[PDB]
Amino acid sequence: VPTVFDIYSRLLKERIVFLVGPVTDESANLVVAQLLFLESENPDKDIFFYINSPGGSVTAGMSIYDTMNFIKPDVSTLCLGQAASMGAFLLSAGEKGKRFALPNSRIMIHQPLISGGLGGQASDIEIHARELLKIKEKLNRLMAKHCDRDLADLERDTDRDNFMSAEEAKEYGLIDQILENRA
Amino acid sequence: VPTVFDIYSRLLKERIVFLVGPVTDESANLVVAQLLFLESENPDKDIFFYINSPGGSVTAGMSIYDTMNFIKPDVSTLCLGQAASMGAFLLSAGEKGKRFALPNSRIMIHQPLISGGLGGQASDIEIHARELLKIKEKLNRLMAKHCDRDLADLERDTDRDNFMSAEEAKEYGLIDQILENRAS
Amino acid sequence: LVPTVFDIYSRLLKERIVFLVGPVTDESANLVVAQLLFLESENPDKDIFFYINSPGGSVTAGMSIYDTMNFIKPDVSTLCLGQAASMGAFLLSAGEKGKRFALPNSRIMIHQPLISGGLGGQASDIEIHARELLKIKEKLNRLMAKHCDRDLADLERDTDRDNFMSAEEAKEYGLIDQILENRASLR
Amino acid sequence: VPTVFDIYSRLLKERIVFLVGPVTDESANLVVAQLLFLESENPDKDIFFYINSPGGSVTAGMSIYDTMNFIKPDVSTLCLGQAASMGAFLLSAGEKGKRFALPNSRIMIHQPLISGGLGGQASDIEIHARELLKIKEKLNRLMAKHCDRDLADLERDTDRDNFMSAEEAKEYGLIDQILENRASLRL
Amino acid sequence: LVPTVFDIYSRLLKERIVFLVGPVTDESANLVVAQLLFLESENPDKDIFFYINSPGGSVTAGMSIYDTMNFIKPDVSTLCLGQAASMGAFLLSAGEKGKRFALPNSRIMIHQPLISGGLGGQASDIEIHARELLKIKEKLNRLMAKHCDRDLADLERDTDRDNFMSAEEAKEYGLIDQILENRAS
Amino acid sequence: PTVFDIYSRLLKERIVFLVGPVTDESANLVVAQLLFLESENPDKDIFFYINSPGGSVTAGMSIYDTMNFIKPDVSTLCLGQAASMGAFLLSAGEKGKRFALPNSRIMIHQPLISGGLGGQASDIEIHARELLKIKEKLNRLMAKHCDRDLADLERDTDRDNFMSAEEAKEYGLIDQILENRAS
Amino acid sequence: LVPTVFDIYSRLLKERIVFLVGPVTDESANLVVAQLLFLESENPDKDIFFYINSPGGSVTAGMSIYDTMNFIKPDVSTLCLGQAASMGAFLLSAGEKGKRFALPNSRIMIHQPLISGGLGGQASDIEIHARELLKIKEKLNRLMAKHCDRDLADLERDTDRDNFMSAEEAKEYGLIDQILENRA
Amino acid sequence: VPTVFDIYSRLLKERIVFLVGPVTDESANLVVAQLLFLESENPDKDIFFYINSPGGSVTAGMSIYDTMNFIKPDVSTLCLGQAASMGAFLLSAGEKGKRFALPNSRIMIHQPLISGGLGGQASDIEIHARELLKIKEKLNRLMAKHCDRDLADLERDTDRDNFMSAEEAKEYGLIDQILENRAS
Amino acid sequence: PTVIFDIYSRLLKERIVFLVGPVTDESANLVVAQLLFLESENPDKDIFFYINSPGGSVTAGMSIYDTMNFIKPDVSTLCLGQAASMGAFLLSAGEKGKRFALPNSRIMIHQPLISGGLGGQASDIEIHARELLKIKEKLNRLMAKHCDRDLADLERDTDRDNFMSAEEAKEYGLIDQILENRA
Amino acid sequence: VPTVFDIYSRLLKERIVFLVGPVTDESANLVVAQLLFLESENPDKDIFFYINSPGGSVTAGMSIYDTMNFIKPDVSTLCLGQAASMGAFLLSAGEKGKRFALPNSRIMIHQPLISGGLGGQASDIEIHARELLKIKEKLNRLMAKHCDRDLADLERDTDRDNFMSAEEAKEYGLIDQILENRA
Amino acid sequence: VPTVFDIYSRLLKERIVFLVGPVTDESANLVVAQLLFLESENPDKDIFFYINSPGGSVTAGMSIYDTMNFIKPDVSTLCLGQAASMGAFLLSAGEKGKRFALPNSRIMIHQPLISGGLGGQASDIEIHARELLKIKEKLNRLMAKHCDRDLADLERDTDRDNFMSAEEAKEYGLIDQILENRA
Ligand SMILES: [K+]
Ligand SMILES: [K+]
Ligand SMILES: [K+]
Ligand SMILES: [K+]
Ligand SMILES: [K+]
Ligand SMILES: [K+]
Ligand SMILES: [K+]
Ligand SMILES: [K+]
Ligand SMILES: [K+]
Ligand SMILES: [K+]
Ligand SMILES: [K+]
Structure with missing residues (x-):
């Protein structure tokens, strides 16, 4: 990683935070730390959250999610390459x-x-299957709110892998705009 | 497996069938084949099913179970060593x-x-969890019938591993008698 | 590891019992095929009893059994013990x-x-196999609907994800004809 | 890890301490080190312990717990992502x-x-089994005290995995408040 | 693991049934050859029934079967059950x-x-084997064109990538002669 | 070699061997031979040769209960070693x-x-209790075999207790030491 | 492992050189993205020089570089040394x-x-991913024909199997503009 | 590891030394080094040795032990989490x-x-077994001394794993006080 | 190969029994089984025990030894190739x-x-160390009897690996005669 | 890493660049970076490229080759230890x-x-085989130019591994001089 | 390794050098380097060589030994934990x-x-066996000198593992004093 401060620390000065690759407890908490840092530095200026990720841990993703909503600054998000699963959620x-x-x-x-x-035992499997169903509906409910869509639409549209181009994600209500250049 | 015909084939002549070790498709189906053969040889004579097993595949076990109930001969069971899980079921x-x-x-x-x-996907996990719950209840329902006990008792008593002595297994209704020797 | 009585399985073959046990593979399937052809050669007029306890396996291997069941003169009677899943249920x-x-x-x-x-491999090759896989899916739903005397749309619906059935449900669905409880019956 | 002091050293200035991932001897003692350091810096100001952990070693978790109760500063805790097992305890x-x-x-x-x-020998297994039962009761007693509940409740509610939403954990007495944003602090 | 009646396969061999099942290797191919030679020896005039359920395999092993089929006096009839892919389809x-x-x-x-x-290996060695592979490829396309009574250009076109065919499609192509549903055609 | 193999031939002389670790398969092979010999002649003695370091308790118990169940006297002979379940049998x-x-x-x-x-502590408790029951059951049965007190067996089995043939006789574990057919 | 002079690559970065070397991964691609954004922040008016020696890699990783190249104001000039294959050639x-x-x-x-x-996975899942892979295949061909100022059909033809090009052929093809022999 | 001078070094200024995890030659000698360092900086002030360890190498543990006793400053010990085997000895x-x-x-x-x-050979096993007995006796004698207890007690009480709570360890004489907080 | 019987079965007719390679429970009991069978065939005729072995399990070897002394036939031994450790003992x-x-x-x-x-525990290591020394002493005592030498001779000459030619072995008391051919 | 600046960075001040061990994309690009750097520092002074390498990736080698010819400074080469294949080419x-x-x-x-x-498929193999032959011809053509020798000679002399002493390499036209010392 | 300067560099200021764990070429040469450095810092002041080691490479150990004797400062040694084999030698x-x-x-x-x-070949095995015997003899000669004892005594006392307490080691002549504390 090149020095200029290293490159990512340098972009952090412009309030750029990256999420790249699999979401793990560690990759996620580093994002959380940067969000908390930027808020501490200036609680009123927007933060720019760049995402290129296939997703990963649900609980790890939620820690980022709850932090995005907890901190005072607006977190703007930008997808480059991909945002899949938890990546798309964020x-x-x-x-x-x-x-x-x-x-x-x-x-x-x-x-x-x-x-x-x-x-494990059937009793244990039952407990974890029920939890998995709550997670599934929970994620569908939150996702529907983000997209200003009916829950029934999210349930239908996430049954199997649902690939969307940028325009399809916009039209779906998942993002707000496609940026071609700074114009 | 010493010759005398191997030892197990010789004992098959006395209508003895063994279930030893894990219940697998192969080990279960070998038992089924032996049950059918003995029935073919004489549909009226009892069969002696010696079980020493920690259990195994539930569907493999059910194939033996259903064959035991389908064939005409009485299938007598004897536990030696241990009968756990599907082993105890049988x-x-x-x-x-x-x-x-x-x-x-x-x-x-x-x-x-x-x-x-x-x-897999949650949908699949839900399906397979539901099937698992069905198996659990079915096995409790069948086991309560074998033991002449309440469904609720079996549900209670199988929540965690439940070890029983021969006398305790008798008391529970799981077997009829403890045999010390051929003298009664 | 197999008792002699002939080995036990050769002995039951005398009673026109044929087993399919465990994963359906080329070798396990062709061994079944051979037993079917043998029993037909011995007596084309007598029924064959095909015992199935299987989670399935290779589709083409399964097809070799299926077509052989249909090709030979004897009626191939089927009996499920333990389980019949996927290609096992098909057969x-x-x-x-x-x-x-x-x-x-x-x-x-x-x-x-x-x-x-x-x-x-290349996207081209993948396109081909995907297209082929879709045909297999379609063909199997068609044949299966015929077996069950059910509408094709019903099978498409009911096979999207794993569908477990008891013997009675399988009877109601049209996959089997009878549930056997015990020997005491037709001589 | 981005530098600004690295990012975590930077947040430590604000008396933020993280527990992330499995609790090990090394991860727990690093938490311990930070708590003692923050106490040394200012023994009267609250410490903010952010927890995202599935748990881990009980003795490692206990080193943190006992350190939290030992030091003069109030250790405030916040769950993000998850707090399961020893994570939930802390x-x-x-x-x-x-x-x-x-x-x-x-x-x-x-x-x-x-x-x-x-x-090992049955004698050794007996000693460790009795110790395991001792550990089980201790944790249930401490947890009941944390949650302001009867010991009997904790014994019932930990027999198998017991998942709680933030709201449920609040009703249970495990946490005090759920924070959506900085305007959420009540009582 | 193989029932006795002779073993099942030996029993079917008395009826001139020869199986090719699974991958074609030197050993599996030569076993077919041994059986072909034996059945010719028992009776050089009666047809042989060669049942094929195979994904293909070694080209040289497959060729030993092929040349043997053409070399012996009896007609070798072939039946696909399950699949005949690659060298399996060739045979x-x-x-x-x-x-x-x-x-x-x-x-x-x-x-x-x-x-x-x-x-x-060295580029020189690589060149020699690439030339051979090219000769092998064309050779097979030519023989296959003859088997199917088709133009070489067609086999070249139709084998550039994996080409799956149903029995009827294999019939229309000229690869087999008839589909047997049962003992009646 | 092949005399029939050598073990089959000796089976005709009512000799049964237990060699090596006691497993479900090795034990049940022994059980089958016992039942076979009883079926051939329920009244003549069986000679059970043991060279074994022990093994599965439940597998061993299938042999033990079979030995007591069948009509013939089962004579035992230790050659090489009989340890743990081997010594028990x-x-x-x-x-x-x-x-x-x-x-x-x-x-x-x-x-x-x-x-x-x-597993869970509940499960571990259950299995610890079962192992303790086994420990006591085996000490009582061993006390009966040796015409000794339960307390002695508990004491003498706390750790590995090696015995010579004479020590084994004095303890009550065997009846006689055979040097040759005389005696 | 890396000489210092600041390390050598940071040093060349002052001259606005960004390297892509070896397999294109999420991490290798985003580091490039970081360098592009940084150089823009340092001077939005000056050219950036992207040196490529790469066998290709993740398609999505590559697009993040691609879209960032097009998004930023500075012209991103590219130079091939060693090789540029697949996503490398695309970039x-x-x-x-x-x-x-x-x-x-x-x-x-x-x-x-x-x-x-x-x-x-399931045939359903397999269908979805094949349809997606085909979209990517057409998408890449369309963009590549545009880069090369060529007809869509030409790229479809010319990318069916591996297509090696010398510098002159790539120039003639429209993939690059000039071959550099000497700085003078 | 957090910088503030990194965190463990920072605590070293307060004469805090940690033993965490298995006792190895390397982990033990690092402790010895810190103890020697602290004595050199100030031979008259107490050292605080925080122990969270399951034990490990006996000779390694002994190098720490002999260094604690050799240096002039009092080495005060604190158990956090656990002190088992050589950890409890220290x-x-x-x-x-x-x-x-x-x-x-x-x-x-x-x-x-x-x-x-x-x-190895029986001769070698004899030598090493004799040595193990002296090690066992030596540690029981040293422990009996630490605990102000009879040697006979230590021999009996360490025959198998012997678990103690903090209060039981105080009562046993292994430690002096239990600290709940800075007031205890 | 088969001969009219596998080749080893055929030589059993000659009352030839082989021990070849490492002495294990299985290899040793196969020898035991052959000895017992040859005794039952004819308790009066010599058995010829051909030994080519590096040794192995002490208990396994002792099973052979005791059987050799137990049965009625004389057991002649012939070393071909090597007889080392328990091989030399037998x-x-x-x-x-x-x-x-x-x-x-x-x-x-x-x-x-x-x-x-x-x-394991020092208590357990002490028990097994004590056991090893007993085994060490008993083997030296028995070998001294075999060789018609005193225990101290054997202690000294077994402290480390002690290789002997056939002639040295004879001189030592370990064998009776070297055989060049069938004289 | 011995520090003086690590040793290699210090020698870079003397305009010395090393190629050591296998030529890979990373090791080659590191060389390229150093060449560009030295040129930036002074485009008129010679660069000294020290090579001890058995070769490696041809495309990686070419990136070094083309960079050596592209930059303004003369790149002097020195062989120490060995220069084989792409190493000898450079x-x-x-x-x-x-x-x-x-x-x-x-x-x-x-x-x-x-x-x-x-x-892969024969089609793919034909494509890659043809390319390999092009690589082979190009390397012989460039090597003949470097050595001022006929193309037919390089074709002949590279059919199999051709080892050369320093003097033989000089005679061949591969290098200009052998240096024993600075005199 | 904590900072104060890492901890070991800090103690080097007090002329403390550690040998910890197995003696290898790398661990031995690091000791040699420190001995040479401390000597250059002050050729007249004692060096304190703290040894906790089970031994290791003989040639690596000799490199330390010869350096200890070569340099002007006295090298005082202290055993903590253990000094075995080459550790005890040093x-x-x-x-x-x-x-x-x-x-x-x-x-x-x-x-x-x-x-x-x-x-390898018997010839090579002979060469290396002869070499090992010279090493055994040299090590006994040097050890005899260090301990002020007869060569024959060291030959006797090193035939098998010889464990010594601090007092036995003092008595043997291997060390001069036992230190309980700085008194
Ligand atoms: K916000
Ligand atoms: K029945
Ligand atoms: K039919
Ligand atoms: K506190
Ligand atoms: K022919
Ligand atoms: K009896
Ligand atoms: K641009
Ligand atoms: K002290
Ligand atoms: K004798
Ligand atoms: K140049
Ligand atoms: K000196």
């Missing part, structure tokens, strides 16, 4: 009016998926 | 009055357990 | 209508095709 | 009145679970 | 003209050669 | 007919779990 | 027209998408 | 009157345990 | 006057060797 | 008159060889 | 009068043992 969670994507950005939404497995 | 499914255990046998019952995992 | 439902059975606690499950591993 | 252990959660936080409590193994 | 189409069949739900697939992991 | 031979060759090694001890107990 | 061809270069012995290669690993 | 080795534990600390003592195996 | 255990070696045989004796290792 | 690409080797340096040239394989 | 090599141990130190001496194995 992209859409940006301050309404300030959710953007670059022209060839890819957005994808879907229902939760467990990689690996559920292992 | 032990308890032997012809009423003809379910036995040796004095130091271990019986154990419990609710279904998935080793490994449920992996 | 069960493909038994001579009127002679498709299940034991009471059998589990049947049907669903659309699923690929193990993956498709890797 | 969240509930914050100074009463200053335990918070973000709205979509996930909280979970349960009895101790150990795997890997218990290996 | 299916190589059956005696008029005697090539498929069951209704059989799958046929043809394509150009695909090479083992990789080829490794 | 040895001591279980028909009283008066339990033997060891002179340089046999006998060892007794309390149960030990290899690998681990893994 | 090379995306440089500001008139300022796309290659060194004389550079290798360019273009082709249709290739799938890493495999497709795993 | 905890109990703090200057008498200055050994503490936090309330929910877990303390455990036992006899030596060998990892891996003893392998 | 060789020197042949009926006195009837222990042989071929001319280029390698014989080696030493003290017990544990490859692997004592792990 | 050594011979130094400014004519300024290509050197130390007395016991090893040079080796050869035709391209593929590590791993050509795997 | 401890015993401290300036006479200045070799110390902490009270619960463990000292161990023994003859050379080979890591891995000796593998």
